[PDB]
Amino acid sequence: LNNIVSSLQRNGIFINSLIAALTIGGQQLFSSSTFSCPCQVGKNFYYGSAFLVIPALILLVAGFALRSQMWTITGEYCPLECKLACLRFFSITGRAVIAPLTWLAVTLLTGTYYECAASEFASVDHYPMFDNVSASKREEILAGFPCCRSAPSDVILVRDEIALLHRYQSQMLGWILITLATIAALVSCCVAKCCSPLTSLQHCYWTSHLQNERELFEQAAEQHSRLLMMHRIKKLFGFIPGSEDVKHIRIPSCQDWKDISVP
Amino acid sequence: LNNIVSSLQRNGIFINSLIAALTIGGQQLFSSSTFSCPCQVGKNFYYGSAFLVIPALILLVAGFALRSQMWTITGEYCPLECKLACLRFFSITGRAVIAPLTWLAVTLLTGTYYECAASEFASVDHYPMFDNVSASKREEILAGFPCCRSAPSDVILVRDEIALLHRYQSQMLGWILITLATIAALVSCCVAKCCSPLTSLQHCYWTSHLQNERELFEQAAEQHSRLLMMHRIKKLFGFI
Amino acid sequence: FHCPCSPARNYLYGLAAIGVPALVLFIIGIILNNHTWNLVAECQHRPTFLLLSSILGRAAVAPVTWSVISLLRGEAYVCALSEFHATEILARFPCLSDFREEVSRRLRYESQLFGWLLIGVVAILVFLTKCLKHYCSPLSYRQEAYWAQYRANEDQLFQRTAEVHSRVLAANNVRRFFGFVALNKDDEELIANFPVEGTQPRPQWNAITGVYLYRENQGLPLYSRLHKWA
Amino acid sequence: LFSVVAFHCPCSPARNYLYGLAAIGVPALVLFIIGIILNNHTWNLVAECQHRRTKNCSAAPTFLLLSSILGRAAVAPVTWSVISLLRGEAYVCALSEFVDPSSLTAREEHFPSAHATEILARFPCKENPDNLSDFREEVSRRLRYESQLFGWLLIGVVAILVFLTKCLKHYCSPLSYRQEAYWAQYRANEDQLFQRTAEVHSRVLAANNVRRFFGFVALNKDDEELIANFPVEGTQPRPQWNAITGVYLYRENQGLPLYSRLHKWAQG
Amino acid sequence: LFSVVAFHCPCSPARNYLYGLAAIGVPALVLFIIGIILNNHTWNLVAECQHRRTKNCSAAPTFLLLSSILGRAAVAPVTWSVISLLRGEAYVCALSEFVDPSSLTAREEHFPSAHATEILARFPCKENPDNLSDFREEVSRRLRYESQLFGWLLIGVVAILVFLTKCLKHYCSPLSYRQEAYWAQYRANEDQLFQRTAEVHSRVLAANNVRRFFGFVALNKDDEELIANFPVEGTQPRPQWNAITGVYLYRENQGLPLYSRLHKWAQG
Amino acid sequence: ELFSVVAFHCPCSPARNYLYGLAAIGVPALVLFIIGIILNNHTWNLVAECQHRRTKNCSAAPTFLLLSSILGRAAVAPVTWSVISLLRGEAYVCALSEFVDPSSLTAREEHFPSAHATEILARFPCKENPDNLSDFREEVSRRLRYESQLFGWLLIGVVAILVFLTKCLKHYCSPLSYRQEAYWAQYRANEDQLFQRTAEVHSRVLAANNVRRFFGFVALNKDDEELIANFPVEGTQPRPQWNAITGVYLYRENQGLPLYSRLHKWAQG
Amino acid sequence: ELFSVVAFHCPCSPARNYLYGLAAIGVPALVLFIIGIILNNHTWNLVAECQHRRTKNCSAAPTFLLLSSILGRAAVAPVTWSVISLLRGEAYVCALSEFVDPSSLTAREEHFPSAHATEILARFPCKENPDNLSDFREEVSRRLRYESQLFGWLLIGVVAILVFLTKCLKHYCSPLSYRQEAYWAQYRANEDQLFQRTAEVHSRVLAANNVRRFFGFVALNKDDEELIANFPVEGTQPRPQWNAITGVYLYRENQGLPLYSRLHKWAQGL
């Protein structure tokens, strides 16, 4: 039964779906817990914009870095070898970039981050209520109502309209981004099915072979290290550990401990 | 099942995650237990500073002591030998410093600590009625208001502005530290990949050799240590 | 728990509320380990300060953990400074609103401030002392591990041989008294398997008891006071 | 069950302090007795005078044994007395009438001077007017402190006493603790197999007596081999029995340590 | 059920103390009478008074044993007297009518003197005016104090007696205590084997009589071995039974102790 | 629910309930007492002793020891039911409700009506009394319950003394050491187990030997075949032979060795 | 809810309920009495005794000693039903509520009307009484219930004496000691249970011996195959042979030995 779970774990679509669901849940928890939408007139666009970008950037970097094989790819970087490196890089990038795309999409769909983000950028010259011959209190109240300040002075309905407008735009952006992303994927796949010299079945076989041989060589290296250490003990103490020791014992002296300290 | 649990323990990804969850949960109760946000006018910046870094620092002290490897490194120290040790030191450092920033980040993103830490250093020039030419009550009220003195005397607006601006500063101070930690981890592994003469494939052999070098030798020591004892008893009492 | 509020007497409780329950825990630790009596035996019969701290600190964990956890609640320290006619009312606060508010926060502020000092001291002590002793000790940790395992296997086998060697003794005397032995099923082969040759002399066991720190002879490593007795 | 064994303060002057002594001391007193009875060291020490009737052993050799006996049975009195003091039920009931009204503070002078003791006596029974609840509370909290203060230092007294005696016992005794561990284990092990042999030798004699009366003895399967394994002829004379009981302090015979009077009797 | 034997206090003057005496004395008496009968050490003593018909034996040897009879059977009344006194319901219902109105406390001189005894009688049953409830509560605790007071000190005097009797027993018994322990294990071992053989030697004689009548005795699988392994030819003489019943005080035979009359009979 | 059937319901009426209470407790005691005699085999052989002689040869004094045993053993059932009812007290209070003297009443002033006294007192157990006399009703209820329990505790006390006197004197005046009597009491209760057990087996075997001669075979279970195979029957035992093992038996000794049961006496011819 | 159907329902009406009281207590008593006779095998061999002789030569001396046993082993069932109803009290109170004397009510003054005393008293068991007489009803209801509960306890006493009287006479007048009667009691049941068991088997073997002749083979279960392989039959038992083991048997001794069943008398060949 657990073998089936591991088999589905090998399915990349399932692991990417798990990543997307986990990122969406984390974003929802973060928004519901620790956002608070600071309401300062001076720099409020900064807070929302940072909330939009920094989590996406750190998730992208984490996805790129958590894959060990990309380090080897870069080391080789720093014919067919170039094509294979490009294919592996694209395949790893896909999973590296799925999560930040999910974060951006869900944030835009929710709309709160964009709502608090570009709120002071709203156009109010159309509305005749906001005269503000001072020209400064207008920006103050504009940044002030979207966060938590109702300020029930007839402006609330206006503010909702403004909010609605921004929210509407947010949704579009999300979907717009989504559209572009999908388009990119398609053309990206085109490259992976146009510049690739290997057959479609050849690529999957080759990847399975690479994973098999990597695991096999790791196991072989561990076993070789184990055998080398076993040999070191059977040459120092004169007996093989884990076997019948009642035959001989070296009884090493003080000078013998220094020899095994070399590695 | 149980073997799977130990097998996943070998991987270092879960080890970092396991420590992170414990720190946040204990902090969420400890911060609400005996923190209480005091408003010591004379010295409250000490209060915020003490329980923002020091409880994280002891984990680093614990982290170094939790590994028997670095004691041997100190003994050898007190070349290729340094190159291998430096990689081990980096790997030891990687698993040892995750916890202190873990608690540091969540406190910064919480915003409760900084409010009670650097309230007295805030700027009061904007508000026109924190004049206080005597320059005595201003320090006290600035370092007295945010704790439990709501003071609905036409100053609550400042207390929201001060807290929110600091909380934004607290929130902004959060990721920036997160960003630098990610940056340092990225280059250090890249440095460890280029500076180390051994290939990553050859790195696996050596690292696997390190993890079983402690076990096999220790097992040999135990068998030899015991077999001596019975032969002493044979001479003493004649019992195996 | 119980928090007395009497003026000029609460500070007595705070010391008793933590110090007395802490020290008894320390006493339990030294009693349970058998290493303390080894030093007592060695001094009775006859540079060893490094060994004393190693065993003393091992039992120090239980008294230490009680001291900090009590300060974590913090009600212990609120009695101390508050006590030091209106002063009595301050002690009645945990049991003139401006006067009581300022002192109460001051007490809790100092309570955790003093509470975390020991933890910082603890980390330094467990770190520096462990490092210096190993550096001071000429033997390597591999030798130290073998030294520890030599002692670890010593006590389990001595207890194992003590019990068996006791039965082969006691059975003889009761046999001389009654005329037979009502030994159990598993113990029937015990007498036959190990017929003891007699009772060993008292000074013979006295020599192997005491403190021993690697007094190597002729290049042959020796680890225990019984080891040199061979 | 637990309802019968409980504390209820008789709120009466010159009477409750007797109850506190009785409701705790006597249960402690009986527990002190119980430890003596179960321990086997007392009777042989008691039987020591019987076989001599002359005081052959001097005070100095025999004073050493007396120290161990009382401490072993002292576990019960201390494991109970401090518990009640921790609850503080005894102290509040006992010395409430003896609390000096002059030291009463944290309140204006309201307690009547006509019957100060009588009012104090009724505090534990929750019988007190609400105006004197403050007066009741301050003493109740004060007595609870003193009781707990008394109770806590009792544990320390126990803690130091065992610690100092143990090293003193090791220092005074000429034997290493490793020697003592084996010797103490021998007594704790020779007694058990002595008792088991007693029943087997008891039954064998018992079976033989019945057979001589009925003509046949009905034994279970395991008792069948008991007759075959350990057949006896008679008994052991009273002087032989007497040479076993009593006290013994590590005699030595030509370098051979002896650990029991039976071992002393073993050599003849 | 417990409801039947539950204590119901008749709140009446000069009447409830009679009931408390009956509701406590009789259950104490019924337990004591049970104790004597079950203890087998009394019947042989009774049988001892029969066979001699002269009283040759003096009282002094009997007195040491006679204490072991009443004392061993006195545990049941004591543990029943204690719980009743510790429960306290019986005592308050016993002495309610004897509370002195003058010695009443916790209230002013408000208690009526019209019929004090009648009013004092109805205290245990909550049949009292609310104005006198303070008086009732005061005596509800003062009386309950005495019961719990009497219970604990009566426990103590019993407790010291156990130690006093046991220590004197080891002081006066000529044999050593460890030998006595063997003697104790012999009495149980003989009694069981004798009793176990009593059934078997009854059954064999039973089957040997039914068979002579029917011509065959129906026995299950396990009882079949009883006939095969244990054949009998007859019964035992009445004097032979008459020589292994009674009391026995450590008669030594030629340096060999004898532990039971049967053993004394086994030596001829 | 049979508990509701035999429940004690007090008919509150003058000169009527005590008659009921007499027949609501005594009669079950009589039934319990009758059961004890019927089941106890020590009374049939005593009856069987009176039938074979037809002359009254045997003296009463030797038989009085056994005559006291049947009544004594069966006396538990009335006592354990008379006592239980007394302690419960419901039986007594309804019985003696109408005898309480109104003048001697306590706990209240002399306001008890005397126009129809017994009528009101008779109604006390059923609680059908005006609340103006509730104190009186409770006072009589408690006082009467007191006498029941005091009588009940007295009753159990008397029985315990009687048992003590009975067993002490029985062991004293019996001519056998009490250890031998235990063996004897472990015989009669052991013979009767075997005698009953073979009564069926020598019956069933005689049953099969009759059906077989009629049908031509006998149906049997697996175990019953062992009964026919192991234990064969030849005929029946004579009626006078049965007559020699029924009755009372009082330690008749032979030659100096005891015979414990009358069957054992016949087993020696 | 079968017991719910047979539940008592008192018809409150003068001169009417006591009929219902009789016919809702007597009839189940009569049904229980009849069942006792029908199922009691000792009553059939009594009937078959007078059947086959066709003359009734035998006198009443041997019949009466058995006839009491026929009722005695069966009359217990009506009594344990008659007594149960009386103890419940429902049967009596509804039966006799009409007869309560209008001058014998107590616990109330003279408030009983005299217009229709029998009618109003008849409805007491149904609790359909005006609240001005609730004292009267709770007096009559509790008084009548006494009379029933007194009669029920007395009736138990009478059986408690008749049983002891009979059990004494049945052991004092019979010519056999009780220990022998227990054998004779343990033989009548031992034979009858064997007879019924062996009748079924010899029936089945005879049946399987005819079906085979009609089909050429017989279907039998695995355990039933053992029956045919063990108990073969040759024919049937003649009627006169079946007619000598039916009837009443009275301890006919043979040549100084006893016979315990009428079948046993035939077993010796008599």
Per-residue H/E/C for D96-124: CCCCCHHHCCCCCCCCCCCCHHHHHHCCC
Q: Taking Cα atoms as reference points, which of F159, F167, F145 lies closest to residue E26?
A: F159
- Specify whether the CB–CB gap between F233 and F202 falls below 8 A: yes
- D200–C176 C-beta distance less than 8 A: no
- E205–F264 C-beta distance less than 8 A: yes
Element (H, E) at A210: helix A200-236
Residues of D in Cβ contact (< 8 Å) with E166: 37
Alpha-carbon distance A73 to A92, whole Å?
11
Nearest CB to A38; choose among B168, B216, B219: B168
- A261–C143 C-beta distance less than 8 A: no
Tokens standing for residue A181: 């992303």
- Specify whether the CB–CB gap between A98 and A18 falls below 8 A: no
Strands F253-254 and F257-258: antiparallel
Task: Give E252's strand partners.
Answer: E257
Q: Which chains are within 8 Å of A by 3+ CB pairs?
A: B, C
Q: Taking Cα atoms as reference points, which of F179, D204, F174 lies closest to residue E240?
A: F179
Nearest CB to B50; choose among C116, C161, C200: C116
Alpha-carbon distance A56 to A101, whole Å?
8
- Specify whether the CB–CB gap between B14 and B8 falls below 8 A: yes
**Distance from the E80 Cα atom to the nearest Cα atom in chain D, whole angstroms:** 12
Q: Which residues contact E248 (CB under 8 A, 6 or more apart)?
A: E258, E260, E261, E264
Contact flag for D and G (3+ C-beta pairs < 8 Å): no
Q: Taking Cα atoms as reference points, which of F227, F79, F220, F64 lies closest to residue F154?
A: F79
Instruction: Provide the CB-side half-sphere exposure for C171 (13 A, CA).
Output: 21
Q: Which chains are within 8 Å of B by 3+ CB pairs?
A: A, C
SS3 of B66, please?
Answer: coil
Q: Looking up tokens 């001989």, which residue turns up? A: A248
Residues of F in Cβ contact (< 8 Å) with G261: 210
Residue in chain G nearest F2 by alpha carbon = G84
Per-residue H/E/C for chain A: CHHHHHHHHHCHHHHHHHHHHHHHHHHHHHHHHCCCCCCCCCCCHHHHHHHHHHHHHHHHHHHHHCCCHHHHHHHHHCCHHHHHHHHHHHHHHHHHHHHHHHHHHHHHHHCHHHHHHCHHHCCCCCCCCCCCCCCCHHHHHHHHCCCCCCCCCCHHHHHHHHHHHHHHHHHHHHHHHHHHHHHHHHHHHHHHCCCCCCCHHHHHHHHHHHHHHHHHHHHHHHHHHHHHHHHHHHHHCCCCCCCCCCCCCCCCCCCHHHHCCCC
Cβ count near G160 (within 10 Å): 19
Cβ count near G38 (within 10 Å): 10
SS3 of E212, please?
Answer: helix
Alpha-carbon distance B91 to B69, whole Å?
11
Residues of C in Cβ contact (< 8 Å) with A257: 140, 142-143
Tokens standing for residue D201: 């030798």
Tokens standing for residue G169: 């006479």
Instruction: Provide the CB-side half-sphere exposure for D154 (13 A, CA).
Output: 17
Chain centre distance of CA F114 = 46
Tokens standing for residue D243: 């040479």
Q: How far is CA C181 from CA D200, D227, F111, in A?
A: 9, 13, 88
C197 DSSP 8-state letter:
-
Alpha-carbon distance F187 to F191, whole Å?
6
Rg (CA), chain C: 28
A:18-77 residues touching chain C, CB 8 A cutoff? none
Residue in chain G nearest F243 by alpha carbon = G177
Residues of F in Cβ contact (< 8 Å) with G163: 34, 38
Chain centre distance of CA A260 = 44
Q: Is residue D218 exposed (0-12), middle (13-18) or buried (19+ Cβ within 10 Å)?
A: buried
Residues of E in Cβ contact (< 8 Å) with F257: 234-237
Q: What φ, ψ does residue F254 adopt, rounded to 5°? A: -120, 115
- Specify whether the CB–CB gap between C214 and C139 falls below 8 A: yes
Q: Which chains are within 8 Å of F by 3+ CB pairs?
A: E, G
Tokens standing for residue G18: 């006591």
Q: How far is CA G260 from CA G40, G190, G252, in A?
A: 19, 11, 8
Nearest CB to F6; choose among G87, G179, G182: G87
Alpha-carbon distance C85 to E204, whole Å?
96
- Specify whether the CB–CB gap between B166 and B118 falls below 8 A: yes
- B217–A71 C-beta distance less than 8 A: no
- E213–F241 C-beta distance less than 8 A: yes
Q: Which residues contact B114 (CB under 8 A, 6 or more apart)?
A: B48, B52, B108, B166, B167, B169, B170, B173
Q: Which amino acid is at B132?
A: N
Q: Which amino acid is at D169?
A: K
Q: Which amino acid is at B49?
A: S
Helix, strand, coil share of chain G (percent; to 5): 65, 0, 30
Alpha-carbon distance F184 to F176, whole Å?
10
Alpha-carbon distance B111 to B107, whole Å?
6
Terminus-to-terminus CA distance in chain A, angstroms?
Answer: 43
**Distance from the A229 Cα atom to the nearest Cα atom in chain B, whole angstroms:** 7
- E125–F142 C-beta distance less than 8 A: yes
Partner B contacted by C126 (CB < 8 A)? yes
Partner A contacted by B66 (CB < 8 A)? no
Contact flag for F and G (3+ C-beta pairs < 8 Å): yes
Q: B11-50 burial by CB neighbour count: b if 16+ within 10 A, else e?
A: eeeeeeeebbeebeeebeeebeebbbbbbbeeebeebbeb
Cβ count near G200 (within 10 Å): 12
Tokens standing for residue A120: 């002071």
Q: Which amino acid is at G256?
A: G
Residues of E in Cβ contact (< 8 Å) with D235: 256-257, 259
Nearest CB to B39; choose among C73, C105, C227: C105
Chain centre distance of CA E29 = 9
Element (H, E) at F258: strand F257-258
B:218-237 residues touching chain C, CB 8 A cutoff? 218, 221-222, 224-226, 228-230, 232-233, 235-237
Residues of A in Cβ contact (< 8 Å) with B110: 34
Partner A contacted by B221 (CB < 8 A)? no
Q: Looking up tokens 């007489």, which residue turns up? A: G133
- A257–C221 C-beta distance less than 8 A: no
Q: How far is CA C71 from CA B33, C65, C76, D245, E229, in A?
A: 12, 10, 6, 55, 78
Residue in chain A nearest C221 by alpha carbon = A253
Q: How far is CA E131 from CA D132, E109, E112, in A?
A: 21, 12, 11
Alpha-carbon distance C187 to C178, whole Å?
18
**Distance from the B121 Cα atom to the nearest Cα atom in chain A, whole angstroms:** 19
Cβ count near A68 (within 10 Å): 11
Q: How far is CA A198 from CA A79, A94, A211, C53, in A?
A: 13, 20, 17, 69
Which residue in E195, E202, E245 has the most chain F C-beta atoms within 10 A of its own C-beta, making it the best mutation to test that interface?
A: E202
- C-beta pairs of B1-10 under 8 Å, 24+ apart in sequence: none
Instruction: Provide the CB-side half-sphere exposure for D210 (13 A, CA).
Output: 25
- E252–D238 C-beta distance less than 8 A: yes
Nearest CB to E205; choose among F168, F187, F241: F187
Give just the sign of the alpha carbon dihedral E150, E156, E157, E162. Answer: positive
Q: How far is CA F65 from CA C204, F72, F166, F170, F260, in A?
A: 79, 10, 11, 9, 16
- Specify whether the CB–CB gap between D10 and E142 falls below 8 A: yes
Task: Give D257's strand partners.
Answer: D252
Residues of B in Cβ contact (< 8 Å) with C141: 68, 71-72, 75
**Distance from the C12 Cα atom to the nearest Cα atom in chain D, whole angstroms:** 9
- Specify whether the CB–CB gap between G253 and G259 falls below 8 A: yes
Partner B contacted by C72 (CB < 8 A)? yes
- Specify whether the CB–CB gap between F261 and E209 falls below 8 A: yes
Nearest CB to C40; choose among D170, D229, D240: D170
What DSSP line would sit under E54-123, residue for residue? S--S-HHHHHHHHHHHHHHHSHHHHHHHHHHHHH-HHHHHHHGGG--STT--SS-TTS--SSHHHHHHTT
Alpha-carbon distance C94 to C102, whole Å?
14
- A263–B213 C-beta distance less than 8 A: yes
Tokens standing for residue D268: 């003849």
Q: Taking Cα atoms as reference points, which of C95, C70, C66, C73 lies closest to residue C82?
A: C95
Cα angle A74, A78, A83; round to 5: 65
Q: Which residues contact B24 (CB under 8 A, 6 or more apart)?
A: B102, B103, B106
Q: Is residue B143 exposed (0-12), middle (13-18) or buried (19+ Cβ within 10 Å)?
A: buried
Alpha-carbon distance F212 to C17, whole Å?
95
- C173–D265 C-beta distance less than 8 A: yes
- C216–A257 C-beta distance less than 8 A: no
Q: Is residue B225 exposed (0-12), middle (13-18) or buried (19+ Cβ within 10 Å)?
A: buried
Of how many residues is chain B composed?
A: 240
Cα dihedral D49, D53, D57, D62, rounded to 10, equals: 20
Contact flag for F and E (3+ C-beta pairs < 8 Å): yes
Nearest CB to C24; choose among D159, D257, D265: D159
Nearest CB to F27; choose among G84, G106, G156: G156
Q: Looking up tokens 């309401």, which residue turns up? A: A39
Partner C contacted by A254 (CB < 8 A)? yes
SS3 of E253, please?
Answer: strand
Q: Taking Cα atoms as reference points, which of A236, A225, A257 lies closest to residue C141?
A: A257
Alpha-carbon distance B118 to B47, whole Å?
10
Tokens standing for residue F148: 């029941």
Q: Which residues contact A85 (CB under 8 A, 6 or more apart)?
A: A73, A76, A77
What are the E-state strand segments in chain B? none
Q: How big is the E-F interface in CB pairs under 8 Å?
A: 160
Q: How far is CA A149 from CA A39, A40, A166, F43, F95, in A?
A: 9, 12, 17, 105, 87
Cβ count near D225 (within 10 Å): 10
Task: Give C217's strand partners.
Answer: C220
F217 DSSP 8-state letter:
S
Q: Is residue G54 exposed (0-12), middle (13-18) or buried (19+ Cβ within 10 Å)?
A: exposed
Tokens standing for residue F169: 């004197």
SS3 of A112, please?
Answer: helix
Q: Which amino acid is at B186?
A: L
Q: Which residues contact E76 (CB under 8 A, 6 or more apart)?
A: E31, E32, E34, E35
Cβ count near F129 (within 10 Å): 18
Residues of F in Cβ contact (< 8 Å) with E43: 171, 178
- Specify whether the CB–CB gap between D215 and E204 falls below 8 A: no
Alpha-carbon distance G83 to G25, whole Å?
10
Q: To one decimal place, what's the resolution in Å?
A: 3.8
